[PDB]
mmCIF file of C-alpha atoms in Angstrom:
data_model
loop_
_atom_site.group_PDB
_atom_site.id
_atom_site.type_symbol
_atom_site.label_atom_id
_atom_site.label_comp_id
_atom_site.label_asym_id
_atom_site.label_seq_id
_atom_site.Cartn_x
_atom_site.Cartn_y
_atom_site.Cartn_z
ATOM 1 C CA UNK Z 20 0.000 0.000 0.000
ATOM 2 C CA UNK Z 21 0.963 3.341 -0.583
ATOM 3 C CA UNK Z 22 0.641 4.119 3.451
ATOM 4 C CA UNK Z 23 3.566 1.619 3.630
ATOM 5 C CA UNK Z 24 5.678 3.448 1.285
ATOM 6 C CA UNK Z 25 5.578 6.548 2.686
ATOM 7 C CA UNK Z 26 6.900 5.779 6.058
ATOM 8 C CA UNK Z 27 9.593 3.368 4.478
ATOM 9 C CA UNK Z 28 11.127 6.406 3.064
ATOM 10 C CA UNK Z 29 10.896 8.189 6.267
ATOM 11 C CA UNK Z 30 12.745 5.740 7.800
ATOM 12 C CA UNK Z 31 14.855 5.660 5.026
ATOM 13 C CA UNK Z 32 15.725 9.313 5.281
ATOM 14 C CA UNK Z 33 15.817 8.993 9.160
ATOM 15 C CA UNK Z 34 19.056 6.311 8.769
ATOM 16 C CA UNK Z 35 20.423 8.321 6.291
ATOM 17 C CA UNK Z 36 21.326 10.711 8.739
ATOM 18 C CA UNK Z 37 21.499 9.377 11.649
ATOM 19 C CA UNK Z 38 24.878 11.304 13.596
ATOM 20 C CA UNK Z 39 26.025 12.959 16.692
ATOM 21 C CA UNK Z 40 24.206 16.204 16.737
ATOM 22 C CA UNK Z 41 20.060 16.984 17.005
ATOM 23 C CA UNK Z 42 17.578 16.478 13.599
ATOM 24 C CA UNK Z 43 13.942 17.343 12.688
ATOM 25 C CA UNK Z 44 12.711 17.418 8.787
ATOM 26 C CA UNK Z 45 9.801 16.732 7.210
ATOM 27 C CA UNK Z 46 9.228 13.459 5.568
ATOM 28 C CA UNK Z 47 6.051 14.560 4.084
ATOM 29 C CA UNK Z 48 7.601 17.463 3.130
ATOM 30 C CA UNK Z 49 10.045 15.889 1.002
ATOM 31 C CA UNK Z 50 7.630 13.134 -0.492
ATOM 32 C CA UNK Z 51 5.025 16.319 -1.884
ATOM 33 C CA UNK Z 52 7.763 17.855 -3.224
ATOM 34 C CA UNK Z 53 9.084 14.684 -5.082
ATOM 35 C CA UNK Z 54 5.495 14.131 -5.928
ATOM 36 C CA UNK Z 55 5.870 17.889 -8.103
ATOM 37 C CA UNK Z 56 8.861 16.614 -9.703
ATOM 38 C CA UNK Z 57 7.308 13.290 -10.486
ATOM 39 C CA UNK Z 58 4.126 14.415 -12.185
ATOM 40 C CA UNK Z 59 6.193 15.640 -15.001
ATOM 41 C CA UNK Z 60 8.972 13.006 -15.439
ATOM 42 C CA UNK Z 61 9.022 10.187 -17.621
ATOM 43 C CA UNK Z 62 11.840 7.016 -18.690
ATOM 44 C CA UNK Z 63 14.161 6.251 -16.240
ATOM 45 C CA UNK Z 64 13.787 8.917 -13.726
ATOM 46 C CA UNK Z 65 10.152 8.436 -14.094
ATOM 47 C CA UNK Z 66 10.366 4.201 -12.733
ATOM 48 C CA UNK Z 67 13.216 5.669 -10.282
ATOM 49 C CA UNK Z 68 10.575 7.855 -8.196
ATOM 50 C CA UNK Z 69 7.190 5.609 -8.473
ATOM 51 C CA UNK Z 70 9.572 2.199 -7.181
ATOM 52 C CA UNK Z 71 8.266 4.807 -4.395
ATOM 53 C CA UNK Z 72 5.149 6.038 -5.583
ATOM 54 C CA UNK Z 73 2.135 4.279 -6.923
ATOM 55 C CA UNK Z 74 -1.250 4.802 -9.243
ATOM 56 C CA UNK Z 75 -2.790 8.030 -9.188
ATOM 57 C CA UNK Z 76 -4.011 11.259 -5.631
ATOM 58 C CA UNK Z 77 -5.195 10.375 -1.977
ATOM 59 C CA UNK Z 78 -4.599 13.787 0.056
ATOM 60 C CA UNK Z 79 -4.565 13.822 3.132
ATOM 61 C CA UNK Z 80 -4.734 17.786 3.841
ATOM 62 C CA UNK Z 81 -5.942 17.899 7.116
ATOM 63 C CA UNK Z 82 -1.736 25.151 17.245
ATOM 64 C CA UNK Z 83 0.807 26.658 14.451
ATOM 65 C CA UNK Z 84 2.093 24.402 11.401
ATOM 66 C CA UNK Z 85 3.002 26.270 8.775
ATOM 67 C CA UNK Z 86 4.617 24.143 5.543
ATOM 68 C CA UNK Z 87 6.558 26.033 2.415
ATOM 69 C CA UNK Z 88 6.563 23.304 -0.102
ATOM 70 C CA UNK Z 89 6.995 24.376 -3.600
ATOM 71 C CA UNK Z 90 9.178 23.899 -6.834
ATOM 72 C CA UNK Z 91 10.686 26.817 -8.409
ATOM 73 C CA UNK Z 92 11.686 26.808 -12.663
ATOM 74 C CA UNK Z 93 14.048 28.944 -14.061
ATOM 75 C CA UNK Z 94 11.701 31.323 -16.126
ATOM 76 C CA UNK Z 95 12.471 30.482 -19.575
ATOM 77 C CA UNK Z 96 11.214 26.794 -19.357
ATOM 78 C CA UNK Z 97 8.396 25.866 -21.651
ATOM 79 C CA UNK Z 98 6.304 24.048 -18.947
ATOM 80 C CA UNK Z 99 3.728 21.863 -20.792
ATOM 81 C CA UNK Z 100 0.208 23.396 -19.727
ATOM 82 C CA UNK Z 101 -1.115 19.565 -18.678
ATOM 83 C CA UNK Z 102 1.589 19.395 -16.240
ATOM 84 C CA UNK Z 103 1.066 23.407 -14.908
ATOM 85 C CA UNK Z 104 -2.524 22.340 -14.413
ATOM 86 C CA UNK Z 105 -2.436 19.249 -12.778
ATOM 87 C CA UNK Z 106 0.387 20.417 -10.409
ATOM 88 C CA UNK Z 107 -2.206 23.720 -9.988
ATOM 89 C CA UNK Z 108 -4.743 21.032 -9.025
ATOM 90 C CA UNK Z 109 -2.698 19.026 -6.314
ATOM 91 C CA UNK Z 110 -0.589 20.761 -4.118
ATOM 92 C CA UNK Z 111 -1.195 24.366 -2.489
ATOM 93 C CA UNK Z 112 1.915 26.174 -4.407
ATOM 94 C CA UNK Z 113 2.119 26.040 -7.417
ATOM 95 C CA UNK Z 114 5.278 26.404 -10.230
ATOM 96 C CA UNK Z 115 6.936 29.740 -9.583
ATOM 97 C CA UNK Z 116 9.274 30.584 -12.290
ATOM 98 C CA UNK Z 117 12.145 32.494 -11.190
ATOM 99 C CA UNK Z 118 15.122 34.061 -12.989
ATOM 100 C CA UNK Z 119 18.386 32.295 -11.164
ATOM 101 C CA UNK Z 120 20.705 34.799 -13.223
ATOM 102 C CA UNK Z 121 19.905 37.178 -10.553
ATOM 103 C CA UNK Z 122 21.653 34.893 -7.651
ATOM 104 C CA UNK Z 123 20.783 37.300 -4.823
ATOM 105 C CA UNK Z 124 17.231 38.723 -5.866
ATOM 106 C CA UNK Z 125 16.247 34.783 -6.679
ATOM 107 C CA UNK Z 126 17.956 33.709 -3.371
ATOM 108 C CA UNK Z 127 15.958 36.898 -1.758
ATOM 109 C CA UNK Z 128 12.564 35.985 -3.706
ATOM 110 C CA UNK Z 129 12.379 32.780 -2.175
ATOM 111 C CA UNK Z 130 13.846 33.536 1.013
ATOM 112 C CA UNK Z 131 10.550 35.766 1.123
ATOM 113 C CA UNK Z 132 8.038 33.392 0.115
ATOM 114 C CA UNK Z 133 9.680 30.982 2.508
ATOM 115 C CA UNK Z 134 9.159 33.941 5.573
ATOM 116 C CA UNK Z 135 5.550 31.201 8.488
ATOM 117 C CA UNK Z 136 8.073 33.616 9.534
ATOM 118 C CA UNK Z 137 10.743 31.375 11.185
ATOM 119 C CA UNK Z 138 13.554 30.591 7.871
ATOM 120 C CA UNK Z 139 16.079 32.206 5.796
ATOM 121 C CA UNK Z 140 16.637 29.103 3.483
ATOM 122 C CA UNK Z 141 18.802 29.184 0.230
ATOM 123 C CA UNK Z 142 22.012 31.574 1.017
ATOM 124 C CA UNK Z 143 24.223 33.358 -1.144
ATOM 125 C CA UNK Z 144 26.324 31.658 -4.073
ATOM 126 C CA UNK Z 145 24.204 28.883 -5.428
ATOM 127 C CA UNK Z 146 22.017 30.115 -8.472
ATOM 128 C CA UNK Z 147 23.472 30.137 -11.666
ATOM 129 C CA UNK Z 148 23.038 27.705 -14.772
ATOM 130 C CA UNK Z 149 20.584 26.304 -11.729
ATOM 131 C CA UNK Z 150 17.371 24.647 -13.248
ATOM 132 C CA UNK Z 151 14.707 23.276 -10.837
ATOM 133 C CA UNK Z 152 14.606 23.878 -6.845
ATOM 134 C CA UNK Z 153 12.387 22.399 -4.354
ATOM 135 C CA UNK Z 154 11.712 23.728 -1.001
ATOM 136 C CA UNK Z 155 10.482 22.593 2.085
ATOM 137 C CA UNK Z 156 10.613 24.966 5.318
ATOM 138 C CA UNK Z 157 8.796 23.545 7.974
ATOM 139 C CA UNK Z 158 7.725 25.200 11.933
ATOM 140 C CA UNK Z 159 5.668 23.454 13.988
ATOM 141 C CA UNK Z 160 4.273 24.572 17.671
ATOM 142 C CA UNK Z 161 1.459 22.490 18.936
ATOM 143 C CA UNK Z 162 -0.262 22.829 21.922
ATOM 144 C CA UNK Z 163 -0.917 19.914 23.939
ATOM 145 C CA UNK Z 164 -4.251 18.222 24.602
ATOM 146 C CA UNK Z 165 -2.783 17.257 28.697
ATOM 147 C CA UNK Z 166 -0.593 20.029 29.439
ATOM 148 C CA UNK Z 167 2.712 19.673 31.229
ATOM 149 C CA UNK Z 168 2.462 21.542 34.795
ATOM 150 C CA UNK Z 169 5.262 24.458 34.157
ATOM 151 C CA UNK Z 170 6.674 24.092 37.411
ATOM 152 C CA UNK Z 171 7.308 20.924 37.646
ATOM 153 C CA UNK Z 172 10.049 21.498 35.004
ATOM 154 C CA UNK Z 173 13.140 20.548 36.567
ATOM 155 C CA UNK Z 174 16.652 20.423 34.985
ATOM 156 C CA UNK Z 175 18.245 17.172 35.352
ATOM 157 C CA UNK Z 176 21.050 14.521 33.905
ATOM 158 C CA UNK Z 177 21.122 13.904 30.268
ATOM 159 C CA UNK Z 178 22.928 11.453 29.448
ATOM 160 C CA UNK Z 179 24.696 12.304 25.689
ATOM 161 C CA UNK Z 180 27.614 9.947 25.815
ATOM 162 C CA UNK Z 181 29.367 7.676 27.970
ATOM 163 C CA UNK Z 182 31.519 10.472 28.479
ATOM 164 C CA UNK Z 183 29.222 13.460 28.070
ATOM 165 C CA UNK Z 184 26.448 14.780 30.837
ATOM 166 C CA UNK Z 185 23.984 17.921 30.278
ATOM 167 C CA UNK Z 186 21.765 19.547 32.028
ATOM 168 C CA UNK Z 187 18.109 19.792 30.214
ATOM 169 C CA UNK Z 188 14.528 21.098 31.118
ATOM 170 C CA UNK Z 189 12.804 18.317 31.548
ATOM 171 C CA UNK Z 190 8.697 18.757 31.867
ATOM 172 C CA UNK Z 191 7.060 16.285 33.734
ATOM 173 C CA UNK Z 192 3.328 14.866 34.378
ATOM 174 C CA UNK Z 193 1.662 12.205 35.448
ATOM 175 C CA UNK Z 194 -1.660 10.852 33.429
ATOM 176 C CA UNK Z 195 -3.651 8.986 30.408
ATOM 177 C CA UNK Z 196 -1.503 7.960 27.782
ATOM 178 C CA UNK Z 197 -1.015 5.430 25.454
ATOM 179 C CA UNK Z 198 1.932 3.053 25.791
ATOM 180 C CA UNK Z 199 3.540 0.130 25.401
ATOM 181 C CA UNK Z 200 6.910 -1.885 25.864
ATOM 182 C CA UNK Z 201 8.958 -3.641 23.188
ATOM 183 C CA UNK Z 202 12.065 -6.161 23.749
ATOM 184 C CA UNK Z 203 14.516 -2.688 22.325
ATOM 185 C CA UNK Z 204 12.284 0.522 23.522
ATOM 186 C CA UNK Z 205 9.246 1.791 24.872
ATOM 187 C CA UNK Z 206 6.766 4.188 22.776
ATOM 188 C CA UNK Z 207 4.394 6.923 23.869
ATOM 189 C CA UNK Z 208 2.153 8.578 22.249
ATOM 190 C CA UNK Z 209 1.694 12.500 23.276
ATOM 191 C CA UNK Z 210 -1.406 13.936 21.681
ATOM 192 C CA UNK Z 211 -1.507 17.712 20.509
ATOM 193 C CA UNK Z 212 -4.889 19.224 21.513
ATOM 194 C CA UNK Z 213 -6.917 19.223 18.152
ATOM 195 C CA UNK Z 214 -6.568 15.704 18.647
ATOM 196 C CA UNK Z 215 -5.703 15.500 14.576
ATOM 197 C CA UNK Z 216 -1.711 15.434 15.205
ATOM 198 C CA UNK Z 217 0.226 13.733 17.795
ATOM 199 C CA UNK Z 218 4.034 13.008 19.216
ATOM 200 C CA UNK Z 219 5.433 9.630 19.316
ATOM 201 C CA UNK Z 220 8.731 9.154 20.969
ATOM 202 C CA UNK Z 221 10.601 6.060 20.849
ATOM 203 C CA UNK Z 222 12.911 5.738 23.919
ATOM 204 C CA UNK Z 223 15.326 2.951 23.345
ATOM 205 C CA UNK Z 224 15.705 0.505 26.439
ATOM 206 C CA UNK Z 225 19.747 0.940 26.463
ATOM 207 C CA UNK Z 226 21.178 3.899 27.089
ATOM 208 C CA UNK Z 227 22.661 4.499 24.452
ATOM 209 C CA UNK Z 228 21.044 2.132 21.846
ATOM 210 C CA UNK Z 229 19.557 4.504 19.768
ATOM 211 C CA UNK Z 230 21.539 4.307 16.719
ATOM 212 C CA UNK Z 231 20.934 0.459 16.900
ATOM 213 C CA UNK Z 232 17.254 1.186 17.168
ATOM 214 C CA UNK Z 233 17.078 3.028 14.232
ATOM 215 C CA UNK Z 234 18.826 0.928 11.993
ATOM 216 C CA UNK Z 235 16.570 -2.296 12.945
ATOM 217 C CA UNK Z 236 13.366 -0.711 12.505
ATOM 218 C CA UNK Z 237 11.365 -0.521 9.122
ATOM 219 C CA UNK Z 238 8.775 1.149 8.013
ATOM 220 C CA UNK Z 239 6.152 -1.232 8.489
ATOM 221 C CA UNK Z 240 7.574 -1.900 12.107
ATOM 222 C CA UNK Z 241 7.161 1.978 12.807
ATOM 223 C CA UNK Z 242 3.892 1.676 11.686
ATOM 224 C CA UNK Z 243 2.293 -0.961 13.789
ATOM 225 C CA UNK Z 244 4.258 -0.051 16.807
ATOM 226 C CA UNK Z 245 2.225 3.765 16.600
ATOM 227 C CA UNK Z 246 -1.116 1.956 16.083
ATOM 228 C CA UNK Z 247 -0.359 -0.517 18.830
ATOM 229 C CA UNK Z 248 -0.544 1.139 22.207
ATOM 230 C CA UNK Z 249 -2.813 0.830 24.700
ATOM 231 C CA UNK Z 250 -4.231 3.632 27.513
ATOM 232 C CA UNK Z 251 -2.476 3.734 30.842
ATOM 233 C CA UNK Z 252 -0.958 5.225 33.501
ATOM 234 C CA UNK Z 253 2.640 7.248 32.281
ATOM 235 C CA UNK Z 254 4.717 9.287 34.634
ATOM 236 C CA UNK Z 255 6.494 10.997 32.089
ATOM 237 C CA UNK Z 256 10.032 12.799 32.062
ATOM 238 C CA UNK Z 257 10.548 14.652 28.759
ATOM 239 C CA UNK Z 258 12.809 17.706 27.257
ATOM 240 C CA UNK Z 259 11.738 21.108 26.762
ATOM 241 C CA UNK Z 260 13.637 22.089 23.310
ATOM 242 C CA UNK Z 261 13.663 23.953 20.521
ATOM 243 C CA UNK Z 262 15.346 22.634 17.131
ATOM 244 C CA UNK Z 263 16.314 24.051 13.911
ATOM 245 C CA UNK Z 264 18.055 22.022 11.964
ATOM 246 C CA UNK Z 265 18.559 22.320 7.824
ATOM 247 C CA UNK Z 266 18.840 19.093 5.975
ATOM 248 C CA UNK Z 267 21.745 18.018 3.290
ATOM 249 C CA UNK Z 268 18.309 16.788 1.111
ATOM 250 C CA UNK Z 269 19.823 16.318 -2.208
ATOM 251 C CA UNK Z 270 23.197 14.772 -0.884
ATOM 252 C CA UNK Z 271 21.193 12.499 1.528
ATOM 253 C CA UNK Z 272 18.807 11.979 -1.902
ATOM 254 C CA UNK Z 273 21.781 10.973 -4.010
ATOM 255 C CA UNK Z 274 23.149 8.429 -1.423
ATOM 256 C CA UNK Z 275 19.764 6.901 -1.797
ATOM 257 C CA UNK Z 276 20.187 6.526 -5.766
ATOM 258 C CA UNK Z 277 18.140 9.186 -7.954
ATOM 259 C CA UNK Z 278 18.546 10.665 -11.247
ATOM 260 C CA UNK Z 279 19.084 14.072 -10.625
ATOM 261 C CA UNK Z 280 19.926 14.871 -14.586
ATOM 262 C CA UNK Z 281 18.021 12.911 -17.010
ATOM 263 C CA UNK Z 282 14.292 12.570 -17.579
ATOM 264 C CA UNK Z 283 11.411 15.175 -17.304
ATOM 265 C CA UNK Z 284 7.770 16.622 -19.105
ATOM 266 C CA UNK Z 285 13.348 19.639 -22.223
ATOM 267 C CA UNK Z 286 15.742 19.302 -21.017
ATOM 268 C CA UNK Z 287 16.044 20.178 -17.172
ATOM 269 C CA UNK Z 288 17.408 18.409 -13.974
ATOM 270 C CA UNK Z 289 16.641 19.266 -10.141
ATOM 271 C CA UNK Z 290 19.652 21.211 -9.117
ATOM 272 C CA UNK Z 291 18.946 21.971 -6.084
ATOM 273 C CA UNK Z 292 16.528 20.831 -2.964
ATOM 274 C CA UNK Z 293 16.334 22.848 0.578
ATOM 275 C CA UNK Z 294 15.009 22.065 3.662
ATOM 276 C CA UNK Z 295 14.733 24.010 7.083
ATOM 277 C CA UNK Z 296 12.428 22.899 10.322
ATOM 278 C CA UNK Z 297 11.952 24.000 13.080
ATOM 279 C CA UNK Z 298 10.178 22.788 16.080
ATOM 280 C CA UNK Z 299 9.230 24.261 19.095
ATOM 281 C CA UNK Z 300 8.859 21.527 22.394
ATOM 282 C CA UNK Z 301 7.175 23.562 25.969
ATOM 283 C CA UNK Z 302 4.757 22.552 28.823
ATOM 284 C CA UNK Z 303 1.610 24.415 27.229
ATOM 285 C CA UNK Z 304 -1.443 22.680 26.663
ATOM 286 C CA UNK Z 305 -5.291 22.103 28.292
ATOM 287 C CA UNK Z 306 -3.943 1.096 42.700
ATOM 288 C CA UNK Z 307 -1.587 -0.438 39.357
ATOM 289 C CA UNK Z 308 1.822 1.840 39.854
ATOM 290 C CA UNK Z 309 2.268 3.959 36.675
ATOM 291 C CA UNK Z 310 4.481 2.665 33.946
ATOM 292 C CA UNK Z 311 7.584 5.301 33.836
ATOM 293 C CA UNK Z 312 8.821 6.890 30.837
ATOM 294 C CA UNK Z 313 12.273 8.989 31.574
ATOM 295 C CA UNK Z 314 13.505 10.499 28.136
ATOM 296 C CA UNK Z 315 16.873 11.605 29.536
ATOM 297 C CA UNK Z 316 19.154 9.380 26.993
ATOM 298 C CA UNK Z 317 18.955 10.438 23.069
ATOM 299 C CA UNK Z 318 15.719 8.884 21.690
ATOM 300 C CA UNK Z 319 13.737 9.197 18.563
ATOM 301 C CA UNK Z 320 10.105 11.431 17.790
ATOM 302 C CA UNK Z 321 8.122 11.533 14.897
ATOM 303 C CA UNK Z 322 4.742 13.761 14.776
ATOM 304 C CA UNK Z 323 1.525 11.418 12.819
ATOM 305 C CA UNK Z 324 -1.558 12.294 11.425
ATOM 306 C CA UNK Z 325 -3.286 9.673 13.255
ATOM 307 C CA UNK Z 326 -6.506 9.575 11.206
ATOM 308 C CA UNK Z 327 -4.314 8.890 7.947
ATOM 309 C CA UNK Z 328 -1.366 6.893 8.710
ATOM 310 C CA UNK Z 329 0.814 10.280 7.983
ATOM 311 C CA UNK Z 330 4.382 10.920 9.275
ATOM 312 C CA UNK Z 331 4.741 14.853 9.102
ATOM 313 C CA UNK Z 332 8.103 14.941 10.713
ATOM 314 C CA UNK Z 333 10.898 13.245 12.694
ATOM 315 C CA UNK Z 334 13.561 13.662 14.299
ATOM 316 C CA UNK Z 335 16.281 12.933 17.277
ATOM 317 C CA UNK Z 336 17.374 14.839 20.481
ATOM 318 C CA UNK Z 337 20.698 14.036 21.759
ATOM 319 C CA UNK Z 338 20.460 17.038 24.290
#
């Protein structure tokens, strides 16, 4: 199913960069934008994308979020008028066409569109003989639906290495929530208060097992694991943070395998694809001993559209 695809690639994405400092992106982010490119490419390129993407689609547009996803031509392409109106009639942005010979006032032109007021996205020195650009820019700040009591935010031991201590803000409460234990990690599921969206974080059961974690779970593991959780008691120890964090996308796309010069619908290659989140993590919001969940060792978070299978975004927090 198509469901199943999507959240293989996040997890694909997810191990592809995998490392030693913090990360948030959008995976759905990424797939609409590869859906723009892929509505107008054909041969090789075209069965490259689509071993990912199937049929023709089923959105799925369902507190601040605010997304920037849209594909930018250099303005003397003749774009076919099918593929102008069917992109018109899918996605919320459609083609801008820009003039890249300008490198600052095409840099600045999107920069603008991207300011949802939290980015500054493509910098100096990178439009030239340029061709195609996707962008995602992503900030997300949800309220709660049970909210963390403020002062009960205490600072206390993160663990980052075997060598490395820190001291974090960790929020704390103690109600409802739905749980459950695995052999490698426990999962909790944090709801955001129109009940739509949601957290999952996946705290691995050794210390510092998270890189193992990540590179044993799939996809269709991820996905029954969020669905499979059951209401109980959670006293729950977890970071207040704030992350922005831009993502290598077309270098982490490339060591994936794509065709990023070759087939599209003449004749024009993606030259360039950005990607900036930012999320925003605070307290605000509304006998069987509880089951604890202490996030103080680097662990894994993803936020779901429950009511359509759909990973918006993921991430890690090492501290």
């Amino acid at each position: 199913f198509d469901i199943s695809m999507a959240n293989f690639a996040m997890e694909l994405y997810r191990q592809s960069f995998s490392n030693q400092s913090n990360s948030f992106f959008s995976p759905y982010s990424i797939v609409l934008t590869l859906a723009m490119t892929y509505f107008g490419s054909s041969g090789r390129t075209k069965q490259q994308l689509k071993d990912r993407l199937f049929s023709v689609d089923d959105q799925l547009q369902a507190m601040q979020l605010h997304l920037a996803n849209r594909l930018f031509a250099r303005n003397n392409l003749k774009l076919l008028p099918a593929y102008l109106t069917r992109i018109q009639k899918t996605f919320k942005a459609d083609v801008d066409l820009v003039d890249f010979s300008n490198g600052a006032a095409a840099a600045e032109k999107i920069n603008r569109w991207v300011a949802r007021i939290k980015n500054l996205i493509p910098p100096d020195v990178l439009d030239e003989m340029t061709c195609l650009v996707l962008v995602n820019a992503i900030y997300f700040k949800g309220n709660w639906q049970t909210r963390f009591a403020p002062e009960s935010t205490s600072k206390q031991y993160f663990s980052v290495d075997q060598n490395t201590n820190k001291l974090v803000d960790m929020m704390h409460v103690n109600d409802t929530f739905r749980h459950a234990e695995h052999e490698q990690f426990q999962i909790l599921q944090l709801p955001y208060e129109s009940s739509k969206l949601a957290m999952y974080v996946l705290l691995p059961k050794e210390k510092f097992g998270l890189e193992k974690l990540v590179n044993q779970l799939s996809g269709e593991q991820l996905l029954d694991s969020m669905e499979a959780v059951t209401s109980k008691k959670v006293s729950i120890t977890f970071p207040k943070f704030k992350l922005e964090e831009t993502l290598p996308l077309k270098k982490i796309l490339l060591q994936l395998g794509l065709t990023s010069m070759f087939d599209h619908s003449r004749s024009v290659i993606v030259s360039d694809a950005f990607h900036k989140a930012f999320i925003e993590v605070n307290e605000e919001g509304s006998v069987a001993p509880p089951a604890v969940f202490i996030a103080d060792h680097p662990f894994m978070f993803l936020i779901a559209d429950m009511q359509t299978q759909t990973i918006l975004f993921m991430g890690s927090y090492r501290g």
